[PDB]
Amino acid sequence: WTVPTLNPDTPSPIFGGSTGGLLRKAQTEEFYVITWEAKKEQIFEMPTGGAAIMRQGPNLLKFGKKEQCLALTTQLRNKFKLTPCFYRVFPDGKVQYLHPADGVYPEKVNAGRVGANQNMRRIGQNVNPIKVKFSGRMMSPAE
Amino acid sequence: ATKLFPKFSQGLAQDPTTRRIWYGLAMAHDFESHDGMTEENLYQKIFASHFGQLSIIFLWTSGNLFHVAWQGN
Amino acid sequence: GWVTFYWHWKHLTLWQGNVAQFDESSTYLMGWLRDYLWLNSSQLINGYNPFGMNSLSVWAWTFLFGHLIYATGFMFLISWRGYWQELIETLVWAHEKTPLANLVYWKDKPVALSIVQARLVGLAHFSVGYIFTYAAFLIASTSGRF
Amino acid sequence: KKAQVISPVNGDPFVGMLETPVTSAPIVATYLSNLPAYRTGVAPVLRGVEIGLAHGFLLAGPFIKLGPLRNVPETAEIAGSLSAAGLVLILALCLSIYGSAQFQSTPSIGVKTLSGRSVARDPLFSADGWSEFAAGFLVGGEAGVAWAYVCTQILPYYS
Amino acid sequence: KKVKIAVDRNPVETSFEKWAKPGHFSRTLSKGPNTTTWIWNLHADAHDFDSHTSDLEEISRKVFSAHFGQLGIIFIWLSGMYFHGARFSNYEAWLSDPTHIKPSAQVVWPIVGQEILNGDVGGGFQGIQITSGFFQLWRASGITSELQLYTTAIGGLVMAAAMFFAGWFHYHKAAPKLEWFQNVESMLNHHLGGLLGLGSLAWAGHQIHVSLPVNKLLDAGVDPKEIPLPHDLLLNRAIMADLYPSFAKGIAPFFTLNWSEYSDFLTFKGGLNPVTGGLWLSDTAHHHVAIAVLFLVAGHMYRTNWGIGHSMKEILEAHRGPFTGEGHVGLYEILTTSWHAQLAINLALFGSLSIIVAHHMYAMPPYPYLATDYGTQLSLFTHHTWIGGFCIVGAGAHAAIFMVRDYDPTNNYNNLLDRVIRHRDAIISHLNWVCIFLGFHSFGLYIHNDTMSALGRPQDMFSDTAIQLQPVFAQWIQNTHFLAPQLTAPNALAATSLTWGGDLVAVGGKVAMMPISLGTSDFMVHHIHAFTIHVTVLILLKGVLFARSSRLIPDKANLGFRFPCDGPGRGGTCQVSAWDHVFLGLFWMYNSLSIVIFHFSWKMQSDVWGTVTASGVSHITGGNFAQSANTINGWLRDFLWAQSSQVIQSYGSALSAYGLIFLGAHFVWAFSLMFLFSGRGYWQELIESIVWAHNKLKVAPAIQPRALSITQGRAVGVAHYLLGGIATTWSFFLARIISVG
Amino acid sequence: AHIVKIYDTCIGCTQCVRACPLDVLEMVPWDGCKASQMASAPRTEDCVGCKRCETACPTDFLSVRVYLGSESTRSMGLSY
Amino acid sequence: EVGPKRGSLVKILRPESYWFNQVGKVVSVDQSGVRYPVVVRFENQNYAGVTTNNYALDEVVAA
Ligand code: CLA
Ligand code: CLA
Ligand code: CLA
Ligand code: CLA
Ligand code: CLA
Ligand SMILES: CC1=C(/C=C/C(C)=C/C=C/C(C)=C/C=C/C=C(C)/C=C/C=C(C)/C=C/C2=C(C)CCCC2(C)C)C(C)(C)CCC1
Ligand SMILES: CC1=C(C/C=C(\C)CCC[C@H](C)CCC[C@H](C)CCCC(C)C)C(=O)c2ccccc2C1=O
Ligand SMILES: CC1=C(C/C=C(\C)CCC[C@H](C)CCC[C@H](C)CCCC(C)C)C(=O)c2ccccc2C1=O
Ligand code: SF4
Ligand code: SF4
Secondary structure: OOOOOOOOOOOOOEOOOOOOOHHHHHHHHOEEEEEEEEOOEEEEEEEOEEEEOEEEEEEEEEEOOOHHHHHHHHHHHHOOOOOOOOEOOOOOOEEEEOOOOOOOOOOOOOOOOOOOOOOOOOOOOOOOOOOOOOOOOOOOOOO | OOOOOOOHHHHHHHEOOOOHHHHHHOOOOOOOOOHOEEEEEEHHHHHHHHHHHHHHHHHHHHHHHHHHHHOOO | OHHHHHHHHHHHHOOOHHHHHHHOOOOOOOHHHHHHHHHOHHHHHEEEEEOOOOOOOHHHHHHHHHHHHHHHHHHHHHHOEEEEHHHHHHHHHHHHHHOOOOOOOOOEEOOOOOOOHHHHHHHHHHHHHHHHHHHHHHHHHHOOOO | OEEEEOOEEEEEOOOOOOOOOHOOOOOHHHHHHHHHOOOOOOOOHHHHHHHHHHHHOOHHHHHHHHOOOOOOOOHHHHHHHHHHHHHHHHHHHHHHHHHHHOOOOOOOOOEEOOOOEOOOOHHHHHHHHHHHHHHHHHHHHHHHHHHHHHHHHHHOOOO | OOOOOOEEOOOOOOOOOHHOOOOOOOOOHHHHHOOOOOHHHHHHHOOOOHHOOOOHHHHOOOHHHHHHHHHHHHHHHHHHHHHOOOOOOOOOHHHOOOOOOOOOOEOOOOOOOOOHHHHOOOOEEEEEEOOOOOOHHHHHOOOOOOOHHHHHHHHHHHHHHHHHHHHHHHHHHHOHHHHHHHHHHHHHHHHHHHHOOHHHHHHHHHHHHHHHHHHHHHOOOOOOOOOOOHHHHHHHHHHHHHHHHHHHOOHHHHHHOOOHHOOOOOOOOOOOOOOOOOOHHHHHHHHHHHHHHHHHHHHOOOOOOOOOOOOOOHHHHHHOOOOOOOOOOOOOHHOOOHHHHHHHHHHHHHHHHHHHHHHHHHHHOOOOOOOOOHHHHHHHHHOOOOOOOOHHHHHHHHHHHHHHHHOOOOOOOOOOHHHHHHHHHHHHHHHHHHHHHHHHHHHHHHHHHHHHHHHHOHOOOOOOOOOOOOOOOHHHHHHHOOHHHHHHOOOOOOOOOOOOOOOOEEEEEEEEOOOOOHHHHHHHHHHHHHHHHHHHHHHHHHHHOOOOOOOOOHHHHHHHHOOOOOOOOOOOOOOOOOOHHHHHHHHHHHHHHHHHHHHHHHHHHHOEHHHHEOOOOEOOOOOOOOHOOOHHHHHHHHHHHHOOOOHHHHOOOOHHHHHHHHHHHHHHHHHHHHHHHHHHHHHHHHHHHHHHHHHHHOOOOOOOOOOOOOHHHHHHHHHHHHHHHHHHHHHHHHHHHHHHO | OOOOOOOOOOOOOOOHHHHOOOOOOOOOOOOOOOOOEEEOOOOOOHOOOHHHHHHHHOOOOOEEEOOOOOOOOOOOOOOO | OOOOOOEEEEEEEOOOOEEOOOOOEEEEOOOOOOOOOOOEOOOOOOOOOOOOEEEEOOOOEEE
């Protein structure tokens, strides 16, 4: 598996237009693009509001928030049994792949993804906040 | 981008929302949760703040005295 | 509030020579309502009427002021963040899509008051209204008689 | 059953504005495009003068007919015009501090015009542009309040 | 044939086996309790039939039999009121003198000193003065005897037992299938022809044959003992042809379409009866004849088994516009598939109807001596107003529940519901703006008047004197309905109400109904009404449209309808659910209707109700509403402080219980604030520190003590808030108006 | 950014990852408390702080722990 | 083998546990080098609704 490049030639589902779509965050900070290959035309539920019709084949869809993309991801994975993958697009054109960051979905092991933010102690073996006092910023004993 | 108002907290100064203003108004005197605060600097800022409270109290009594003397009977 | 109600009524009945009214009515709570809160509000709330006003009108206005602030704290105390954040999402849409007004844009993103923050804000509105209401009532019901 | 009126904005169903007769009727878009706010090629100082003249002329009326001195015959218009002058001054200060606050980032994304041609950014949305816009707003607002007073003084059927 | 009876024989066995096993209706609670939250969930999910199972047939059967149980309970309650009017009332004494004797139908036992509550109401009676208006209703029915109330009570108990037998039958013995419930064409045809058409026709028959002659003789001074019994007015046509000579013609004028001959008992008089202060029963009889015809022709509209008629699916599907996409398609399926979509509409219109009832029962008092019982009139406005607001909030609730559970986006593509959910942001944004606009321009007017009159500038207030905001549109409508019989309703002898204008009707010295003027105070309070209504609509509609998703939480539908929060994340997500929007819409419904009923009470006591002893109408508060209600201090002083003198000095008198429920309601309301201001996590730790003391003494229960759910805390808080506030208002109203009115 | 720490009491039931609506958590093999999986939080820049993860953690209390930290646009669920 | 038997009653010594100083019954003890190997089932459920939890050999004690 290798990181897929975002295809802009991918069509979008049949949506009649909403008001829950993109805001100035898309133009200024960032927005998100989710893609998936469908086997048929199915009326799914937009996380922004309203129902859209996915197209037979590949689809592409814009969203202003990552939680929207993962909501649709779990909806397409659980109700339609698809395998979508979304990105993070910046207004200058930079695309950043996000969800299956190793190819497989994060609930499954991949035999090589590194464990981050793992405290190797018990939650009661954390120190008292008096020991992490005056560490610069206000810091939790979990660090 | 990163703002300037919460000089005492860099996590708030990077907040893009209106929460920065409020939480900087309400974390201003929690000196021990400031950025880069030591214990000695804490005690010193508290010393100066007590001096400021004293000045304010005495100005308040001066104002009561002044207004009773001026606009009172 | 209980402490100061007790003090104020005991002393209003002492100063008026009517300690018997307290000795009779303070043993039940309709006594405290009627003979203390309802009775002694007579000049306060008539501080201003459609016929005119007197010097107690400031304390009447302040009375109603505290009644407003207290109840406004109820808004931050009962309604919680998530109704208001979605409301503000709608208002963000409304501002970004309104012509001649999307020209003007915020620099700080409008979000609802946080949980702890609105707890403090409701407590502050509550306390200010409590305090102002009782201060107005006290000063007006004591200055109106004496 | 054909001929649906409501369309998405510029054909994009994911942006979220839903082009609608109140939004993008020919007459409505014509009127909004002709307003000095949306004349992104003219100098912002003059658009500010025009906007300020309008707003300073309209907001004298309330202070005149509803102010505290509305019932004394000749002092009413003077009082309301001075009040509108003060409010225009306050608004000009608001505009100046808004220009201080907003225009520091210079966002790099372009602007199109619902037909593809990449127009330039409005010089109004720049620090110097908004400075001169608030200058024009002050000048035009005070002038419009003064002329509102004048129109109370000279108009025949001013009741 | 399509529309037919379709039932299953003996679906559910009748046994107490599932009575001994609580929580049987769900898969989670049937395992048994381990924590106390189970005890609350057992009750919160008791009638949540659409989560006990998925098949709409069993849900529908449960709903049907539950409705039967509600009907049986309503019949028990009605029979109880008739029985209390038969045994424990002064009704037969009140009929002889309804202008002097207070209607009472509840006697209190003399146990712990509450015999003081058995007030001197009149007619040699001692009891609690009722305000439900049953005496006026019974006089209008033509009862005139306690035996008829007794037998009506026994008939109500018979019908209650019948309804409960019917629920048991239609659940356990022969329960209908889903395709029987789904015949909405037949249900509407029948509920319009037979239920509301034939019901109004039968009530018209009673009004022709029993109410009209009995009440005509009652108004002619005849003693209720010497009035002919209704069966004697049925058999002996001579009595009726003496009272109405058109009964000498028989029913021929009907079949010959010489209906004008019937103009003796089918009238269009309009206005009020000068001797009773209520609507003419001939007017009501003609009314019910007319609406019976109307509903019987309206019940022949939909197509059931013979090709004539309409398919509601065809009306809906063929109603679509260029602005609205596919239109009403899929709504037939929504409403024949979702019980909650039906419940939402039905509750909304039923509550709006109850408020219609409240407004139309005081301006057009239908019953004799109803208007001059100011307590009954005030209570009957307040009660139905409150029931309407509650039903409307429940309509918003069940609309949200539909949107969460029963909504399917496949059925709804570019139909009206999809197109609403797609632009909910425009909807709620404009609603927010109008709520803010109205709040400012309706309450800041009151604040402006408070500030002006406090500063001593009454010439700067918003009053009928200084700066007039006259309600010219309502004034024009008043004048348009006052002048209606002259031009636009020539066969009406008078206007519908005297509130439009004209002369007053005073009965027994008391004012039954008089013209109602509207000025700046009425403008301001009406705009306050619209403001509060719009905010309640904002909350409930925002809960509906954002019940599945928002820009904050896109997966709110999977979270559910009733959930506290997703977390403290996204800055904090508490009360994002569509349940918490109902929880807040309850508060705003209370705030709206409190002002509505306050407007009613003050306007009635100031500008309508009163006595005429000499030449001059002397009202209760002296018409202060015009000049005093421009300020919040006005509603304080001259309404909440002035009209509270009767409830706080009621101690030691018959109305002392009203003062008691004043104080206790103030208690309960404030008690609600323990649940609304606080949060579960504090009480769980307090509870576990208490459980430590219970463990130490070996008295810790097996059912683990938990703090109430978050949702349950909010529900308890809103319940205690509404109860205390409404009961405080109830006590205040009744104690005030039983004394001064 | 909020602080999500995961402790060695994690029995590896994947529930915290399935509950996460922002794809902050993932399950790493054997480079943790033991073999047979373990969780991890590499993408905490996208954590909003909803604590669905520790709502779904079945261990005593919570192996996964969200400590609410400095907010941003990604950590406040803002589409604006 | 390590730990208690697979039906024994066990008092939990984990300080942050809901069942601290509370008796539980062993479901099983994983005989690998796993940390927190002891699986204890409790008659009463915690605030999350769980009745089972994994504990270490030093967090368990008889009776
Ligand atoms: C005595 C006769 C009888 C018997 C033995 C049963 C037995 C059963 N019924 Mg049937 N049922 C009956 C009569 C009976 N029913 C009647 C008369 C009705 C019409 C209302 C129904 C309608 C009905 C439905 C719709 C359902 C059942 C169900 C059930 C099962 C469990 C019910 C349960 O938990 O009961 C215990 C419940 C109660 C004791 C509640 C009684 C509520 C009464 C009616 C109203 C009282 C309200 C009260 C006035 C409020 C006071 C307020 C207070 C604060 C003062 C069981 C097979 C359920 C089933 O099959 O699910 C598997 C089911 O869904 N029954
Ligand atoms: C002329 C025919 C007719 C009449 C009078 C009614 C009347 C009623 N129906 Mg409807 N219904 C009908 C036809 C009719 N229905 C048909 C054909 C269907 C199939 C589509 C339905 C399906 C239906 C459902 C699904 C529900 C009702 C409900 C109701 C009741 C609503 C409660 C109310 O308004 O209080 C008014 C109360 C009264 C007027 C009290 C007297 C009731 C009398 C005794 C029964 C009416 C006659 C009855 C329908 C015929 C059978 C008599 C029986 C001896 C066999 C009401 C009694 C609801 C209800 O309350 O359920 C219990 C409900 O859930 N009905
Ligand atoms: C549902 C409403 C209703 C009902 C029930 C009645 C009933 C009655 N009206 Mg009224 N009426 C009504 C509405 C109603 N009215 C309205 C709306 C108007 C205004 C137009 C009038 C205007 C009016 C006038 C002007 C008069 C009446 C009269 C009558 C009576 C004569 C009936 C008659 O001649 O019709 C004929 C009806 C039938 C032939 C049906 C009889 C059916 C029987 C009962 C069948 C049962 C037999 C059974 C199968 C077997 C026996 C069982 C056992 C013994 C073995 C009767 C009491 C007359 C009267 O007596 O005045 C007091 C009269 O003069 N009515
Ligand atoms: C025709 C009327 C009607 C019908 C059939 C329903 C039916 C239903 N509603 Mg809806 N609802 C209604 C009116 C109605 N509601 C109204 C008027 C409101 C506004 C208050 C609501 C608000 C509402 C909400 C917010 C919710 C429901 C829910 C439900 C479902 C389960 C209700 C349940 O189990 O409660 C069982 C009964 C109780 C728990 C008793 C409540 C206790 C009350 C508050 C006590 C106070 C009442 C008393 C008169 C005051 C005196 C107290 C005295 C005892 C001291 C069920 C489908 C729930 C649902 O479907 O969610 C999944 C839900 O969350 N309803
Ligand atoms: C007295 C108590 C109080 C007050 C003033 C408010 C005020 C408001 N609520 Mg809240 N609310 C409260 C209690 C209160 N609420 C309680 C107890 C609950 C139950 C939980 C709620 C639940 C609730 C919900 C659920 C909603 C509201 C909404 C609203 C707004 C609608 C009205 C509006 O914008 O008009 C304009 C503002 C007012 C009328 C407030 C008074 C201001 C006056 C006019 C003077 C202005 C002063 C002026 C600017 C001078 C400034 C002086 C300078 C020195 C600063 C407003 C902010 C709604 C909302 O935000 O959407 C629109 C909404 O959806 N509230
Ligand atoms: C609102 C309400 C109420 C009340 C109500 C009422 C009162 C109603 C009524 C209703 C009604 C009052 C109804 C009625 C109905 C009736 C019917 C349904 C009848 C039927 C009959 C029939 C069906 C017959 C037939 C026939 C004959 C026998 C003659 C010949 C021909 C024929 C065959 C046709 C209350 C407050 C309590 C509560 C709440 C709710
Ligand atoms: C009304 C309301 C809002 C909306 C309030 C908005 C977001 C902010 C208030 C609007 C402006 C900023 C009012 C400012 C007026 C103050 C007088 C400013 C004084 C502060 C200075 C002294 C610094 C919430 O965000 C909320 C959150 C959680 C629980 C309850 C509530 C709640 O009740
Ligand atoms: C007071 C309070 C509590 C504590 C209330 C406790 C848990 C329950 C109150 C009393 C219960 C119902 C015990 C009453 C007695 C039992 C019904 C058993 C009967 C035994 C004899 C008395 C007959 C909360 O749990 C809570 C949660 C969320 C928001 C606000 C609050 C809140 O305000
Ligand atoms: S708080 Fe929410 S977003 Fe953050 S890690 Fe936990 S579940 Fe994921
Ligand atoms: S839910 Fe808890 S136990 Fe399960 S994998 Fe996540 S952190 Fe570990």
